[PDB]
C-alpha cells in the first residue's frame, strides 16, 4: 500500500494507472489512522 500511496509519480488522470493488489494481508487500519488524507470515504463498505 505504501508503494501505491507514496509512489513518486502518479499517472495523469486521462491515463490513470491501475495496480492490482492480490495475495496479501492489507491493514486498512493504518490508512484511516493516518491523517495525511483530506478525503477517505468508502461506498458499499465501512473502513472500520
Amino acid at each position: 500500500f505504501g508503494e501505491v500511496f507514496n509512489a513518486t509519480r502518479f499517472a495523469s488522470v486521462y491515463a490513470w494507472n491501475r495496480k492490482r493488489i492480490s495475495n496479501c494481508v492489507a491493514d486498512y487500519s493504518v490508512l484511516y489512522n493516518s491523517a495525511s488524507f483530506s478525503t477517505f470515504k468508502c461506498y458499499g463498505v465501512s473502513p472500520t
Partner: protein
C-alpha cells in the same frame, strides 16, 4: 420550533476543537475526535 417546546433540562457540552474536524461532532461520525475524545449518540436530540 425550539421556542415553543418545554424540555426537562438542557446540557451545554462546550469545548474548542480543530477547524475542519467540526463535522465529526454528529451522530454516527467516525474519526479522530468522534472515537477518541467526544461522540454523540445515534439517538441524539439537540443542536450543535
Amino acid at each position: 420550533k425550539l421556542n415553543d417546546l418545554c424540555f426537562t433540562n438542557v446540557y451545554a457540552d462546550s469545548f474548542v476543537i480543530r477547524g475542519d474536524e467540526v463535522r465529526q461532532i454528529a451522530p454516527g461520525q467516525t474519526g479522530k475526535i468522534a472515537d477518541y475524545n467526544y461522540k454523540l449518540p445515534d439517538d441524539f436530540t439537540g443542536c450543535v
